């Protein structure tokens, strides 16, 4: 369309890594500056 490319996002391989670490019963959680959880899965994996 002639514009410039946007800013990138989280790669899918890191999501695969997080899921594979959860399968080993390890809780991997991404946090912001205030130590609060940051959901990298866009609310598609939260009950």
């Amino acid at each position: 369309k002639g514009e410039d490319v946007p800013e990138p996002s989280v790669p899918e391989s890191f999501r695969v890594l997080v899921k594979e670490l959860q399968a080993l019963a390890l809780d991997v959680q991404t946090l912001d500056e205030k130590d609060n959880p940051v959901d990298i899965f866009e609310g598609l994996a939260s009950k």
Binding site: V16, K19, E20, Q22, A23, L24, A25
Partner: protein, 53 residues
Amino acid sequence: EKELLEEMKHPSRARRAKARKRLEVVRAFLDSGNRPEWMILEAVPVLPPDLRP
């Protein structure tokens, strides 16, 4: 932790090293808030199917 801290006063160097090694794990659990019994599994997680296609 109190017992191991008391043990860490022995003149023996090997005893002190063993107490320190146990204290490392004890203090890691105490600091993290993890429960030791969580090292035994009751429910086994199952990977999403698209990653085991």
